[PDB]
Amino acid sequence: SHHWGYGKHNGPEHWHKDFPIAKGERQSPVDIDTHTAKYDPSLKPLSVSYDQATSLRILNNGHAFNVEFDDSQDKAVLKGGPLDGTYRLIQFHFHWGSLDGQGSEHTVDKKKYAAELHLVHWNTKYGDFGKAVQQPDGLAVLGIFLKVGSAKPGLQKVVDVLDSIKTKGKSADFTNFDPRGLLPESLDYWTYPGSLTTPPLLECVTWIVLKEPISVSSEQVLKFRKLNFNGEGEPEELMVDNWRPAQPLKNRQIKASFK
Ligand SMILES: NS(=O)(=O)c1ccc(CCC(=O)O)cc1
Ligand SMILES: NS(=O)(=O)c1ccc(CCC(=O)O)cc1
Ligand SMILES: [Zn+2]
């Protein structure tokens, strides 16, 4: 069974023994060297179309928490930018640190943010998520950095349900949540071909990482850090530092949408 995690004994430096693609040619995350990324005029406008998004449930999976969406129809989709065709939102989750100075997966000129939001989408040409993760263009993940400052009003409903999903395997109803409240003003981005950042580390992802971070309050991120990796009744292991560090860029170029 899967027994990877983020500890010293099961963390990122161990994953390659059960998931050898961990040492592959298009792994994520990466450091975004802002001076080496090149503006790409070929990029078409990015279209985030979440008006009809239908959230259903929030789940503590022992690695992070997922806010899950009804992806049985094109209710919430990502198009444009580097993407060919339509990518449907299935879930979002975060990665965060034990302290405000770390937590993001991607870095920007080696800077680590306090957290990183991942909105996960699958290419509808492949019919469902499981088939999409067999394809090099199966997924698109919209990544958004979080810095600590003023509160993000649209995050507070997520924060407030976390007490009900403290431990691994717990879920709660989470209907009528609008993911548009988690976006920054600007859709300026960097993009590159990469992978899932957790096992199974599959190389299916077009990454779209927004330049502008959102601000969340210290009190909001402190509540993330009260979650548990462990199950109910087990010794407490706070869910913190659930991020993979930057991986080798190898034969890739990062493109910028902005000049
Ligand atoms: N390569 S990996 O998936 O990161 C991994 C690392 C450590 C163990 C040992 C876990 C145990 O005691 O069950 C199992 C699997
Ligand atoms: N952090 S990330 O790259 O946005 C990501 C997205 C989805 C999975 C789910 C993988 C699975 O279904 O096993 C794993 C990791
Ligand atoms: Zn993620």
UniProtKB/Swiss-Prot annotation:
Changing residue 6 to F: Enhanced activity. Optimum pH is 6-8. The record marks 91 as: Involved in the binding of some activators, including histamine and L-histidine. GO terms for molecular function: arylesterase activity; carbonate dehydratase activity; cyanamide hydratase activity; zinc ion binding. GO terms for cellular component: apical part of cell; cytoplasm; cytosol; extracellular exosome; myelin sheath; plasma membrane. Its cofactor is Zn(2+); Co(2+). Changing residue 17 to E: In Jogjakarta. The modification N-acetylserine is found at residue 1. Changing residue 61 to L: Reduced activity. The active site is at 63 (proton donor/acceptor). Changing residue 63 to G: Impaired activity, not rescued by 4-methylimidazole (4-MI). Catalyzes the reversible hydration of carbon dioxide. Can also hydrate cyanamide to urea. Stimulates the chloride-bicarbonate exchange activity of SLC26A6. Essential for bone resorption and osteoclast differentiation. Involved in the regulation of fluid secretion into the anterior chamber of the eye. Contributes to intracellular pH regulation in the duodenal upper villous epithelium during proton-coupled peptide absorption. This is Carbonic anhydrase 2. It comes from Homo sapiens. The gene is CA2.
